[PDB]
Ligand binder design. Sequence first.
Ligand SMILES: Nc1ncnc2c1ncn2[C@@H]1O[C@H](COP(=O)(O)OP(=O)(O)OP(=O)(O)O)[C@@H](O)[C@H]1O
Ligand SMILES: Nc1ncnc2c1ncn2[C@@H]1O[C@H](COP(=O)(O)OP(=O)(O)OP(=O)(O)O)[C@@H](O)[C@H]1O
Ligand SMILES: Nc1ncnc2c1ncn2[C@@H]1O[C@H](COP(=O)(O)OP(=O)(O)OP(=O)(O)O)[C@@H](O)[C@H]1O
Ligand SMILES: Nc1ncnc2c1ncn2[C@@H]1O[C@H](COP(=O)(O)OP(=O)(O)OP(=O)(O)O)[C@@H](O)[C@H]1O
Ligand SMILES: Nc1ncnc2c1ncn2[C@@H]1O[C@H](COP(=O)(O)OP(=O)(O)OP(=O)(O)O)[C@@H](O)[C@H]1O
Ligand SMILES: Nc1ncnc2c1ncn2[C@@H]1O[C@H](COP(=O)(O)OP(=O)(O)OP(=O)(O)O)[C@@H](O)[C@H]1O
Ligand SMILES: [Cl-]
Ligand SMILES: [Cl-]
Ligand SMILES: [Cl-]
Ligand SMILES: [Cl-]
Ligand SMILES: [Cl-]
Ligand SMILES: [Cl-]
Ligand SMILES: [Cl-]
Ligand SMILES: [Cl-]
Ligand SMILES: [Cl-]
Ligand SMILES: [Cl-]
Lengths: 167, 171, 162, 167, 172, 171
Amino acid sequence: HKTLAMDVMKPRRNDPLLTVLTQDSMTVEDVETIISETTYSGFPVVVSRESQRLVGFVLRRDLIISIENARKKQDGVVSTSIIYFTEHSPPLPPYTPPTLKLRNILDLSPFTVTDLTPMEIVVDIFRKLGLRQCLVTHNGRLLGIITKKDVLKHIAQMANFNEFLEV
Amino acid sequence: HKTLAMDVMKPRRNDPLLTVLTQDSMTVEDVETIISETTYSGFPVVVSRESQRLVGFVLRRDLIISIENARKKQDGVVSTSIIYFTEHSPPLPPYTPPTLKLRNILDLSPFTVTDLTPMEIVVDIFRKLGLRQCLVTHNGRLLGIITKKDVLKHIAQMANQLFNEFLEVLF
Amino acid sequence: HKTLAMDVMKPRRNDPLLTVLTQDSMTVEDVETIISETTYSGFPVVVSRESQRLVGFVLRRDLIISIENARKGVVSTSIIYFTEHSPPLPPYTPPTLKLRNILDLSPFTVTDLTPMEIVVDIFRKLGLRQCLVTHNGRLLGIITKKDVLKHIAQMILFNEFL
Amino acid sequence: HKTLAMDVMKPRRNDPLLTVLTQDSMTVEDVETIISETTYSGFPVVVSRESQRLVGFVLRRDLIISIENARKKQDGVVSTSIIYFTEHSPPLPPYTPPTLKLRNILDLSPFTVTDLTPMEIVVDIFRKLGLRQCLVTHNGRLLGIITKKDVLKHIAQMANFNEFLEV
Amino acid sequence: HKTLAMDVMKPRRNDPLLTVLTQDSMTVEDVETIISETTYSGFPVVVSRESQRLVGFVLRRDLIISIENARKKQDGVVSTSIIYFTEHSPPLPPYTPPTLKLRNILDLSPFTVTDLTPMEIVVDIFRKLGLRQCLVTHNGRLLGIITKKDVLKHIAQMANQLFNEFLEVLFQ
Amino acid sequence: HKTLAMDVMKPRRNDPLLTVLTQDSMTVEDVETIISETTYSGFPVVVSRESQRLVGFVLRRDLIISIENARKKQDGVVSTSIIYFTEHSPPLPPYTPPTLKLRNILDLSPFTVTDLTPMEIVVDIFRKLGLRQCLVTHNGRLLGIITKKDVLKHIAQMANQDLFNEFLEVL
Ligand SMILES: Nc1ncnc2c1ncn2[C@@H]1O[C@H](COP(=O)(O)OP(=O)(O)OP(=O)(O)O)[C@@H](O)[C@H]1O
Ligand SMILES: Nc1ncnc2c1ncn2[C@@H]1O[C@H](COP(=O)(O)OP(=O)(O)OP(=O)(O)O)[C@@H](O)[C@H]1O
Ligand SMILES: Nc1ncnc2c1ncn2[C@@H]1O[C@H](COP(=O)(O)OP(=O)(O)OP(=O)(O)O)[C@@H](O)[C@H]1O
Ligand SMILES: Nc1ncnc2c1ncn2[C@@H]1O[C@H](COP(=O)(O)OP(=O)(O)OP(=O)(O)O)[C@@H](O)[C@H]1O
Ligand SMILES: Nc1ncnc2c1ncn2[C@@H]1O[C@H](COP(=O)(O)OP(=O)(O)OP(=O)(O)O)[C@@H](O)[C@H]1O
Ligand SMILES: Nc1ncnc2c1ncn2[C@@H]1O[C@H](COP(=O)(O)OP(=O)(O)OP(=O)(O)O)[C@@H](O)[C@H]1O
Ligand SMILES: [Cl-]
Ligand SMILES: [Cl-]
Ligand SMILES: [Cl-]
Ligand SMILES: [Cl-]
Ligand SMILES: [Cl-]
Ligand SMILES: [Cl-]
Ligand SMILES: [Cl-]
Ligand SMILES: [Cl-]
Ligand SMILES: [Cl-]
Ligand SMILES: [Cl-]
């Protein structure tokens, strides 16, 4: 009966899984096919798909420019080059291509809310803090995302309730 | 060096670990001793000690009332009764006393900030949202706590001193 | 230990009572003499001096303008009323004057026992120039914006009220 | 022209008087019966019914708890004890049963607005100070009450003009 | 795509030009006919008509009171008396009637926005600063006006659709 | 003496005129020497030096980036190439090099305040709108600039006093 963060977050019920980058296991081609196949403004970065523990958030525009420059740089970066967002590379097999550190375009302090947070509180946070997006979590794990336009679409939905009257 | 959330949060460098409750595995006696041995206004609730995954925040004031109400009823809840913050009671062996659900006093939406967040941005969040406290995390794992008083103490340190940074509180 | 509105409000203990105006018993001269003696930024208006019931607040800068323009059968013995209509006067008395349209009919009020941390809070959140202090419906004193500032200079717990 | 506080306040025209407490003359059963026959979140307290000079505002919650704990205390509190919200008891004859002071649960600083105050301002005050209710006075005389729920219903009705857009 | 200050500002396309006062060159009579023939709350005053450089904003009611009080004085102030909002009286031909200084009723700090400014930004400024009106310029030249009611009408129209700009208002 | 915007704005009487770019007549070489010789975060662009009519505000960051890119390209910009911020190019003599349109990095709606605006009002505006800087005009003409830091320093001066009541209002 009470609208919560999980009710508004994407993905919804019949939506695909959250489009996420791993901190350690994405190749340059993986991320490029993500950039070409999506229009999302940004991507959460997690430790692994298993943990779904949030490492940060990275914008599409930054990735394009970074990777674009990277292949353009002759450090030898190729398609099968592993990208990492950690300070140091992960352990790599004998004959593997040069890596690409993208730590410097990662937002290490993304705004996050619990899935059980009331939407009234999320709306308020968005207004007072001027958020462009919010990540939604359950017990430390990444579940979904709420953007500014999602918040607006939710407000619109209510407008047709007394919770709409207090916003 | 810019001051971050990790620089203001407790525990400080090489102090004992955050005083936390588990969502599942602590008894009334556990909580009783924690309450008895500490004066903290509240406690983070974590999935487990090894996971340190944040579940919520629970006030001492509220723990006291609930545990004292649980005693008076004399309905099986004893010192060896398990306290749980989940929706359902944890699976327990035979002859174990009834459990105590304290979920209704758990704040399941505590505010959180990464350990790397600039204190400037923390101070602003406290001001804009009127936070009583803030929890500090690393990669989804609970690390520390900052309270309104910790922020005020931090601001006071700047106030009478780097003074321009204090004036950033106005903006 | 807690400082209240009655500890900051004027008049202080043993000070001349509030320079107030009435709504039915204030002649032009009585107002002109008050302006020519005091230098307060504004004056409250009450039903009567005996009732001390708050009707509104009128600024000083607003009083002089309206008085000097109405005398250019308004004399020194003309009763000024802050109500909507003139009170019943004897047939011989000269015409009256209405200053209703320059009175703040919705001034802000606080009780004499209101904690200053709340008075200051209301001054910041509403941006008040002044606040009238009452006790059980009766005007008692006044706290201006400068009084709040002088109380802010008094005060650890200072940064908490920011 | 403008809608004023006296257009939204309760009680409405041809409605029953405000359910109020006196500061000196309510007994223990008097208040209890008032509590039982009403559902209002709270009640104003006035010097006397004749004066309607506002003394404070007390919540239903606090009245219930205070009164119940007073009978449990062996001060000798009974059904016919005088309840007062003043600092000291009213002049009583010696043979009268011990009294019950309830000043410590009275809001001595309730927010008040004059009846001529435009609702625009009232809404603003409610929004800026986050009020639960406001008391409406006329020349130092309590006239009515405006709660937050009252204000929201008023905003709702505005939509059905640009006094609405003003808010 | 998104609405600009120039889309909301008045006067609209092909209506008479902004009604302004010059800082230096208009007569008591000029202002009086403007006052009695319009209902605008106020008027921008500009350096000159050729420059359209904003000096300030002046309320109608203040002009009425000030001009009324002046003609009743006299000094001198006749229909052909020049009104100036500058600090000093303008250089004038010999044996002309006394001038009228109305600077003490001029708002020398009006708020201005460029015509290219998004309404979303304009609405936010009006809100946060509590503006009564806003003047709109092009490259330092006065072009138009937007009053609080103009903003309110804009928001109202926005609700009947671009519609996300109205949702941005309910959100801010 | 009530402090006004002209009292806090730069340049002060002792300073050289504002460092400004023109909308139409600066070459790439002109803007590069300016960037080399100054440390200002940004520059107002005016119609012309004589008119000082404001067109916008451009940042140093963006000037550097955009210019570095323009001269890297074949058949791109050279020292003598004219930069412009207008929608269309100015009329140039034939056989002159390619021009550089920098309209796309220009803030076309920079906040502006008249020189006679009380500083108290300027401060309110900075806080409420969250400005980085504010351009100060006299009768439509660009006169000076007030940056956030300028404002913070002005406030600090009022704090380090004992005038102090005027600082308390800011608090
Ligand atoms: N990385 C992601 N993975 C899955 N869904 C996402 C991701 N990022 C955003 N979304 C969701 O997809 C939708 C598109 O959001 P996106 O960030 O692409 O722009 P937006 O916030 O809708 O605003 P706009 O389209 O104006 O930039 C939103 O509902 C958002 O919650
Ligand atoms: N659960 C906890 N475990 C470890 N340290 C804590 C915990 N809770 C609070 N602290 C730290 O202990 C100190 C005091 O905590 P407390 O909860 O008493 O908050 P406080 O507001 O400082 O005290 P008070 O509410 O009386 O002003 C603070 O520095 C706080 O960060
Ligand atoms: N009507 C009044 N009667 C008695 N005292 C008053 C009255 N109005 C204000 N005061 C007191 O007079 C003192 C001076 O305030 P005053 O009204 O002169 O303005 P201020 O607060 O000094 O600010 P300013 O003079 O710059 O407008 C204040 O402490 C105020 O409480
Ligand atoms: N003491 C009172 N006497 C008369 N009417 C009252 C009194 N208190 C409240 N009311 C009116 O009764 C109605 C119900 O108000 P009440 O305080 O009971 O709750 P509310 O403000 O409606 O909020 P909620 O219904 O969610 O508890 C409101 O219109 C209010 O104005
Ligand atoms: N000097 C002016 N010249 C041309 N148009 C103006 C001028 N002043 C205002 N306007 C426009 O004329 C219309 C009426 O403006 P005006 O200020 O008279 O009333 P308003 O903004 O509706 O406020 P009010 O209800 O108090 O009269 C508005 O659309 C406004 O933009
Ligand atoms: N284009 C300019 N011409 C003249 N003076 C300027 C110009 N731009 C800024 N200033 C002034 O020069 C000083 C430095 O401004 P600048 O924008 O370079 O840095 P700042 O914002 O003051 O501080 P910071 O180094 O943190 O950005 C300030 O006093 C500012 O008012
Ligand atoms: Cl894990
Ligand atoms: Cl889990
Ligand atoms: Cl890790
Ligand atoms: Cl009467
Ligand atoms: Cl009486
Ligand atoms: Cl009394
Ligand atoms: Cl031009
Ligand atoms: Cl100087
Ligand atoms: Cl010119
Ligand atoms: Cl000039």
